[PDB]
Amino acid sequence: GHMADYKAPLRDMRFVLNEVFEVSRLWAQLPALAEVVDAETAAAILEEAGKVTAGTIAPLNRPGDEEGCQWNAGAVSTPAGFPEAYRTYAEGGWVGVGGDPAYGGMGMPKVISAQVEELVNSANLSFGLYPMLTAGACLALNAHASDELKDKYLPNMYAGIWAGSMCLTEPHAGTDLGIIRTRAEPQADGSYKISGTKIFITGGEHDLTENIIHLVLAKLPDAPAGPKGISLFLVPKVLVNADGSLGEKNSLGCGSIEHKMGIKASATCVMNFDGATGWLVGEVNKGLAAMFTMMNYERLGVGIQGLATGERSYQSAIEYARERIQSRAPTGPVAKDKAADPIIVHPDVRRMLLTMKALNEGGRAFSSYVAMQLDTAKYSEDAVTRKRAEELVALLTPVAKAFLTDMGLETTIHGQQIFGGHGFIREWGQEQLVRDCRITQIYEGTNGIQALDLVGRKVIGSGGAFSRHFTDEIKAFVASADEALGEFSKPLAAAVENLEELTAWLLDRAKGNPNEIGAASVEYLHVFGYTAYAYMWALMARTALAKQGEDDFYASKLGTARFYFARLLPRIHSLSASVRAGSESLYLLDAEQF
Amino acid sequence: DYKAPLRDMRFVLNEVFEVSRLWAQLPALAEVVDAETAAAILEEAGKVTAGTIAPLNRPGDEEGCQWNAGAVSTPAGFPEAYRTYAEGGWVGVGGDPAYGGMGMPKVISAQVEELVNSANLSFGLYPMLTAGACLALNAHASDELKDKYLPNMYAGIWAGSMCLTEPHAGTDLGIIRTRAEPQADGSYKISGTKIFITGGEHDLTENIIHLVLAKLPDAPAGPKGISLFLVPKVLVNADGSLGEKNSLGCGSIEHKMGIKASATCVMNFDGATGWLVGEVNKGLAAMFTMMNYERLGVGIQGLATGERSYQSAIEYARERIQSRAPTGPVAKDKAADPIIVHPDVRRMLLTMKALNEGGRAFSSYVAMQLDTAKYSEDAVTRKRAEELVALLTPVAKAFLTDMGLETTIHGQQIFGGHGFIREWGQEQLVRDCRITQIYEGTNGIQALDLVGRKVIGSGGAFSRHFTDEIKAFVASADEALGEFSKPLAAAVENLEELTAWLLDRAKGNPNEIGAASVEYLHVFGYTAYAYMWALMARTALAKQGEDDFYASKLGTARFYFARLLPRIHSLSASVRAGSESLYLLDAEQF
Ligand SMILES: Cc1cc2nc3c(=O)[nH]c(=O)nc-3n(C[C@H](O)[C@H](O)[C@H](O)COP(=O)(O)OP(=O)(O)OC[C@H]3O[C@@H](n4cnc5c(N)ncnc54)[C@H](O)[C@@H]3O)c2cc1C
Ligand SMILES: Cc1cc2nc3c(=O)[nH]c(=O)nc-3n(C[C@H](O)[C@H](O)[C@H](O)COP(=O)(O)OP(=O)(O)OC[C@H]3O[C@@H](n4cnc5c(N)ncnc54)[C@H](O)[C@@H]3O)c2cc1C
């Protein structure tokens, strides 16, 4: 089956970064980046990422799903060719592309590392997860670990010689980390002995790397109840001798791997810690704070994973829709040389194709806009600019997490539906992308919890002020619009006004009743998402209108823009009516009446 | 953990639709079914689906089918469970008593179909194909073929298949290439490959009776040259016993996302003996009544996966403790509150609940229309029911399966990370549900049929038959029902206005039909569900106090009206944008 191989969308990625956001203008100013990345460097990095992802990584995706991982007396093996692909990936510098050059990382800004993330996850989501975990663990160690821990573990982790894991989830504890049971017993020598059971640990055990550095959430015996008793620990699979060589295997193991709907090449481990030796990261009781930066970057990364599956689905769907012939166009036969017309002639096929296209390109734009905010928070020399950026990271990362993953699933489902019956057959690859995409809505925080964060902490919690940072920039953009941009800036203004009135309705309603927050959450986040994508599409329309006639690319972009505004943006109205119904109808029945 | 929703089924048929008062003026049914007969059959369907079918769903998925030198084997326990199912009369629950079928009307066979499909969709498909094939033969085959094949097929001893699809011919059956050579003995020799054939080969039965679309050497080109043939796996002697293996077999089976215990075969006919069903060149029409009953059938498959997911999700949401209710800890004795306390978990549960109970009611309503069309003594009542069946079966197929998928996704989401683990059963229900939106006509083709044939083709008369019944219902409503009837009237108004817009916009502009199709069918669906919910609300309002079941119904109705019905506004606005934005790019610009 399949037919369609992965090709990196480098043309669209150049349009978003270089033409829309003009990131290289910003690099010139910020002297932390000025001597790390320019247009030339960035282009060569993406050119190389496209080659390794399409050439080595993508051809492993299907066979990885069909084989899955194997557990053999506590050792986990990845599908054939995974250890070899990983070695190539790590030696190329790809594990630490966004890593700190102070410990041998490449130091690329998030707008570049995010585009690399998208390429690897589109080619093979299971594969992409492995280095994503290592990069995530480096952020937490860099931000909060002691100089001794950082000097001992970070260099091998940015080089991808040593892998990372995040050991948070327990049988009774995923969302509610405050009730974890894993214990850390302080030792006289300054270390801790970690005892407990962790579940659903991605890459908790595998055969890609000689060591895995686990970040383990635990409580000291004397810790407070709840999340304010949580501490974070660095726990190596293999303890490291004084000379930096591998020494004694730590008192921890993988008990089993899970049987899953998807990302079957991603080893998902029950990890048992039996007084495993570990070192505090950050401060006692401040384990959640130790992961604050990690989670901001991981929220965007998981959003990118959802987008990535949508993009892969679309490359297969447009190739299939031009090749597969069935029936005739309703205006009459289009392929008069053939027995039937390519299925792209049919209105409903174009509706599904254009929904995928508008969501993938809008999602790609929004992922870069949020990467730009992470880069401003980190690199801006101005305190007011960094603070505005940080507040925009707090507001938008939940939206990037929940919205890109929800739209990704919708996209992968459209991509499968375009194949008809063939779409249900595994050799065509479309059914795997639905199963792969589905995890991105559940882990690194369920989408329901992402939306409770948004409405609870970022909206109610800031009096609306964090939203208004975003919606004030969109109206400033609207006030700037020429006549031609008016086609997009006018419906955008109306969407922004809808969102502002819904925000005000919610701030009023949440005063009486705390149930109002959770009731509105997921649908409010969607209203916010379609509004944000209207902003991304308006921005992309401005550039394409200016460059119209210079290249066919700009015509395609404007057509996709016009689809988004005509057919997808009106989704805000029903979502706003549903939110405005309130929580009353959610609480008419007691638990027994369900 | 699967329990048949027999109380809800009793409510829909006996309390809302008052199905026994309809059976009173259906003479051909008073001899065959009444309320007690119905209840007792459902109680038996409940036991066999829960006891012997449900336990095989997970291991069936995990094992799937195997191909060994042309022989296809189903998973461990499938043959034994099929034999028990067949011996119980369940394959022929809806079939003609003239050949040993039980003769139960569609309202009752539809509820049996719900139980088997929610227990094990893979399992449910097998008997569904046989019953489908029985409808075609009964309607169109000669007395010789009916007398020879139907009795064993209704008893479940012989299975059926539909051998339609070819590599280049799926949605477009008109471009079929399988040949039928006429023989002097009055039989045909069939040659060609069929693909994606559910139960083309398996180990459940001694014989399989294939209904194969093929063309005679002198057939006219296109769909007007297509004939239907009965092609048995094993030829049958005079004494009715098994003769020689017929000249056909299975080349391979498909590797699928879901329904993995359902054998999907590449069938090779190499001069296989067959017999004409109905008339030469009328092969497609020989399946009109079959495809009407199977469209509702695939609708019910989607609904059934949604109902199984909800039974798991509601048990999990009461048992799993995580965090504390926004208004304060309730489980004072525990480390955390049951996740049913959280607004978002209640939203996902009530969405599943409202779609499942809404789909059950609409399904029963369409089944009631198939029964009225078939058994009504007066021509005008039969004629209107036939028109509502033609209008409503694509809505039942596409809307119950689309709502089914959404329902199974909510049910997985409620389990959190556990929802992605196969042992918990939620993720299988999403993969199994997905097929129902694709086969028996893609939902896109179901939408095209609705707007293209049933609306444009009738000048909106068919939909005015439906909407007239709804407005009569509204006009009759006392003030208590007004809570539901008022927003139902506004939804009916919205649909009519959208219909008028669509009839006008389609004139001279064929692209407008396809462009509006899927989103219009959803507007229709939510309007239809609003009608079903107002009907169930009137009966629950009248019976309030008599039992907690009615308080639960009214509460579910309130959620549907407050949070789901408003979905019509955005869908209406997308439809009204027209086909223009669909046709801005040429194919190369994608
Ligand atoms: C698991 C499985 C079981 C099956 N069982 C059987 C069986 O037992 N017997 C059997 O005969 N068949 C069977 N089929 C085949 C099936 O019923 C259909 O042929 C198939 O679902 C659709 O055909 P396709 O995959 O060739 O899609 P295509 O017809 O190629 O369609 C591809 C896409 O184009 C769209 N499209 C096509 N034509 C039009 C049009 N005119 N207007 C608008 N959109 C259009 C479709 O909606 C779809 O989105 C089965 C299929 C599967 C996957
Ligand atoms: C394939 C896979 C990979 C994973 N990888 C990792 C990993 O590497 N490391 C790791 O530590 N974890 C990992 N996880 C765990 C994952 O993050 C959790 O499963 C997820 O956060 C949900 O937690 P849970 O399964 O315990 O569900 P629960 O927290 O029990 O949630 C159940 C349901 O209740 C809802 N709910 C819970 N609390 C609230 C609340 N306060 N308000 C509203 N709704 C609420 C949830 O949204 C959900 O719908 C992985 C999971 C899987 C399946």
Residue numbers in the entry:
A (entry chain A): -1 to 592
B (entry chain B): 3 to 592
In the authors' words:
In this work, we identify the dominant fatty acyl-CoA dehydrogenases (designated FadE1 and FadE2, respectively) required for growth of P. aeruginosa on long- and medium-chain fatty acids. The resulting acyl-CoA enters the β-oxidation cycle, being initially converted to enoyl-CoA by an FAD-dependent fatty acyl-CoA dehydrogenase (FadE), followed by sequential hydration, oxidation, and thiolytic cleavage reactions. The FadE1 enzyme has a broad substrate specificity, being able to use both long- and medium-chain acyl-CoA substrates, whereas FadE2 exclusively uses medium-chain fatty acyl-CoAs. FadE1 (601 residues) and FadE2 (592 residues) had the same overall fold (with the backbone RMSD of 1.001 Å) as other acyl-CoA dehydrogenase (ACAD) superfamily members.
The structure of FadE1 and FadE2 were solved to a resolution of 2.08 Å and 1.94 Å, respectively. However, efforts to solve the FadE2 structure with a bound fatty acyl-CoA ligand failed. However, the substrate cavity of FadE2 was blocked in the middle, allowing FadE2 to only accommodate substrates with a maximum of 8-10 carbon atoms in the acyl chain. The blockage in the FadE2 substrate-binding cavity was due to the side chains of three amino acids; Met130, Glu296, and Gln303. In the crystal structure of FadE2, the side chains of Met130 and Glu296 protrude directly into the substrate channel, creating a physical block. Similarly, and although it is conserved between FadE2 and FadE1, the glutamine residue (Gln303) in FadE2 is oriented towards the substrate channel, whereas in the C16-CoA-bound FadE1E441A structure, the corresponding residue (Gln302) points away from the substrate-binding site. However, by comparing the substrate-bound FadE1E441A structure with that of apo-FadE2 (with no substrate bound) the analogous residues (Tyr440 and Tyr441, respectively) adopt an exclusively “open” configuration. Moreover, unlike the situation in FadE5Ms, where the loop containing Lys338 forms intimate contacts with the pantothenate moiety of the substrate, in both FadE1E441A and FadE2, this loop points away from the substrate. As previously noted, wild-type FadE2 was completely inactive against C16-CoA. One FAD molecule was bound in each protomer of FadE1 and FadE2.
